[PDB]
Symmetry: none
Subunit: 127 residues, 2 copies
């Protein structure tokens, strides 16, 4: 069927804060992953209509992409840094779920995940 | 307006040889790229009538696709491995010529080209 609406990126009913960790997630982590050569299939929601992949949103019921993560950080959607880390992890595991071990797109996602973990290793200490 | 005939894949007046490099180009290179998740647009000649690309064959005068390269290797059309490498390069550059920087199909071709170059980096030594 159609693509779903993209994930929500603003929450008017949630309090907001800036923290060293959230700032780092946007300015360093999201900036480094976006520019990686393997990033583009993960930068926006999968457009299953344009690709003619009717089963994508039958299989992936928790979609996530780097464009959504960028918007959530910019809109202070996340109170805890772990909420953002979970969204990255959802994006990577969605690739592993939809595809098969050893697929090329999976290898791309695995390399992005290794870079993400290397950058998370340098997250500033919690307040 | 119409599609041309596909590229020739047999040459009865050319001598034939089976080499380490040609074997690898079919069994490893052609096979790996064929199975990549981004391979579908490159597996057969561009059907410009069905894709509604009437200017495709006015711009691309040296068409090439993976299916033609596969048949070329199976039929011993190539004497030198470089002849096959040239056909892959023609496939990738045709995509860049017809389309524009940053187009989804160009990013697909670029990923296939980088993987192709990695596999060529491991071509067996020339006899």
């Amino acid at each position: 069927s159609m693509n779903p609406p993209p994930p929500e990126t603003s929450n008017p009913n949630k309090p907001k804060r800036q923290t060293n960790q959230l700032q780092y997630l946007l300015r360093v982590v999201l900036k480094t992953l976006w520019k990686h050569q393997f990033a583009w299939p993960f930068q926006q929601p999968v457009d299953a209509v344009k690709l003619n992949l009717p089963d994508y949103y039958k299989i992936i019921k928790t979609p996530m992409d780097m464009g959504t993560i960028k918007k959530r950080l910019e809109n202070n959607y996340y109170w805890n840094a772990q909420e953002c880390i979970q969204d990255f992890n959802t994006m990577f595991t969605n690739c592993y779920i939809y595809n098969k071990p050893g697929d090329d797109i999976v290898l791309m996602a695995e390399a992005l995940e290794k870079l993400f973990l290397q950058k998370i290793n340098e997250l500033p200490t919690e307040e």
